[PDB]
């Protein structure tokens, strides 16, 4: 389609810290790709973000019953909307599954690759260690990061570089909020 | 419980 | 210091389509949108909506003053259309693949406005839609959104995939191919 599209957009922000101690809210409004204006509860009055934005910090900031709902927002909306999903969303705890296999290098490099995938948890916070012979490995570990699959669960794949010797014993490590005890995979050549 | 909906307002003319 | 958690209501409208979304995200996953031609809340994961509620008429009167919005922008801007940002398409697995243990296909889609795509699967360069699920379009930090597209599999070593991503930033539809390792 070639037809011109024209987009308005709007985000309502509740950023939380320390639980709901302090409460930062954002009313952000975007015309196609441009952030024009926006209401920060820190600040207490629209302000434009850039020249389109100017009628409507004028105009918004004299509507006298609309910038009192935006002041009151952090108790409001924020703190109210954090407490009505609070079990399923901060207390929301998926346990990992951890499943450690070999990989080769491609071509091939002196050393070849252990991969442990640790999947299907949730929150996206984790701790997935490397050990070779009851001894944490810190170097030749390489990890793609944290990945967010867009369903409530994360996965990581964490990678140790190895030059894998008849009787060594390699063992992933993982800790998770969802598990009270680190959680071992042992692999053995 | 309910979520609650920040309601939207219209811009200046 | 650093912030623990964060709820967005993200909310569009789009013209000429006359199309547009309502949607809650917390740390970046969909709680739940309104489905605009039903007028009714469909959440994410069905435990959700046994445990919290959402009246889907705030969302309809909200998206109402989007449209509105959207008219009075279009003429202040004097009536400068959207360019078109293509995404990018990243195609994985649930989980690491085992021959024929049931596994899931992960179509995401990234960094792209306006929020406008059609998404194809393909097996064998055949379309294939049993199973297959999304989420709506997603609010990041920028003006730019995400999507996750998704369709359950059998693993095995003769089937091919492609996760087809049309946008009207794209030249040509865009495929994103998997298969099977070794
Ligand atoms: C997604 O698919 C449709 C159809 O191929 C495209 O939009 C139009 O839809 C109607 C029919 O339902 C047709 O009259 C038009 O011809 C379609 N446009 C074109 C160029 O064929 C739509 O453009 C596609 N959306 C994206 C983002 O690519
Ligand atoms: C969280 O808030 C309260 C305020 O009384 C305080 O006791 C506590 O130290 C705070 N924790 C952090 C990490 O700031
Ligand atoms: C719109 O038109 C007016 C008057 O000609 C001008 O001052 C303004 O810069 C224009 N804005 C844009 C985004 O083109
Ligand atoms: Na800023
Ligand atoms: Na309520
Ligand atoms: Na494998």
Redesign the interface.
């Known amino acids: 389609?070639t037809?011109?599209?024209?987009?308005?957009?709007?985000?309502?922000?509740?950023?939380?810290?320390?639980?709901t101690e302090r409460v930062?809210f954002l009313?952000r409004?975007?015309?196609?790709?441009?952030?024009?204006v926006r209401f920060d509860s820190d600040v207490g009055e629209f302000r434009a973000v850039t020249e389109?934005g100017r009628?409507?910090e004028?105009?918004?900031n004299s509507?006298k019953d609309?910038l009192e709902?935006r002041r009151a927002?952090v108790d409001?909306?924020?703190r109210?909307?954090?407490?009505?999903?609070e079990?399923?969303?901060?207390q929301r705890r998926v346990h990992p599954?951890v499943?450690v296999?070999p990989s080769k290098t491609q071509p091939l490099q002196h050393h070849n690759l252990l991969?442990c995938?640790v999947?299907?948890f949730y929150?996206?916070s984790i701790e997935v260690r490397w050990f070779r012979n009851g001894q944490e490995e810190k170097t030749g570990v390489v990890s793609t990061g944290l990945?967010?699959?867009?369903?409530?669960?994360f996965?990581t794949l964490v990678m140790l570089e190895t030059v894998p010797r008849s009787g060594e014993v390699y063992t992933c490590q993982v800790e998770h909020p969802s598990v009270t005890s680190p959680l071992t995979v042992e692999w053995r050549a | 419980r309910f979520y609650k909906t920040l309601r939207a307002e219209q811009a200046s003319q | 210091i650093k912030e623990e958690h964060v709820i967005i209501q993200a909310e569009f409208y789009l013209n000429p389509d006359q199309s547009g979304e309502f949607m809650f995200d917390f740390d970046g996953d969909e709680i739940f949108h309104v489905d605009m031609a039903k007028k009714e809340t469909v959440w994410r994961l069905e435990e959700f909506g046994r445990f919290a509620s959402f009246e889907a008429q705030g969302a309809l009167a909200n998206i109402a003053v989007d449209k509105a919005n959207l008219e009075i922008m279009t003429k202040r801007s004097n009536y400068t259309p959207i360019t078109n940002v293509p995404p990018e398409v990243t195609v994985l697995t649930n989980s690491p693949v085992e021959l024929r243990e049931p596994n899931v296909l992960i179509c995401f889609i990234d960094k792209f406005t306006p929020p406008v795509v059609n998404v194809t699967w393909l097996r064998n360069g055949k379309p294939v839609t049993t199973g297959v699920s999304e989420t709506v379009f997603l609010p990041r930090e920028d003006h730019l959104f995400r999507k996750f597209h998704y369709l359950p599999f059998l693993p095995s070593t003769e089937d091919v995939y492609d996760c087809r991503v049309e946008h009207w930033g794209l030249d040509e539809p865009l495929l994103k191919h998997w298969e099977f390792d070794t």
């Open positions: 389609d037809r011109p599209r024209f987009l308005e957009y709007s985000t309502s922000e509740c950023h939380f810290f320390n639980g930062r009313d409004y975007f015309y196609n790709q441009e952030e024009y389109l009628p409507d004028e105009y918004w509507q609309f709902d927002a409001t909306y924020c109210h909307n954090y407490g009505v999903g079990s399923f969303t901060v599954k499943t296999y991969v995938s999947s299907g929150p996206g990945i967010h699959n867009g369903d409530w669960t996965q």
